Design a protein around this ligand. Structure first.
Ligand SMILES: [Zn+2]
Ligand SMILES: [Zn+2]
Ligand SMILES: [Zn+2]
Ligand SMILES: [Zn+2]
Ligand SMILES: [Zn+2]
Ligand SMILES: [Zn+2]
Ligand SMILES: [Zn+2]
Ligand SMILES: [Zn+2]
Lengths: 26, 26, 26, 26
């Protein structure tokens, strides 16, 4: 469970950064 | 932008799958 | 923990649908 | 599209916060 939660956390954080990039590009 | 959005949304769908498995394990 | 996981699951699923909308609109 | 993306990314940031709390509770 620990490893899976860490991976979701990582990916969610990356999404914030990617979506902020998209917002700026749009 | 379209390709990046698709990668993000596919990962969001994987999060549903992973969270559902965490629910089962808990 | 159960209630919080359910809410994240719900929201992730909604994001798939919203992001697929954005993909179509773009 | 920009407003919707902002709502999504703000929720992604909340998921990091919520997942981190779940880690602590577990
Ligand atoms: Zn995400
Ligand atoms: Zn991702
Ligand atoms: Zn992921
Ligand atoms: Zn499953
Ligand atoms: Zn999401
Ligand atoms: Zn949301
Ligand atoms: Zn949420
Ligand atoms: Zn916290």
């Amino acid at each position: 469970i620990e490893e899976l939660l860490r991976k979701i956390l990582e990916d969610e954080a990356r999404h914030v950064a990617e979506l902020e990039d998209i917002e700026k590009w749009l």
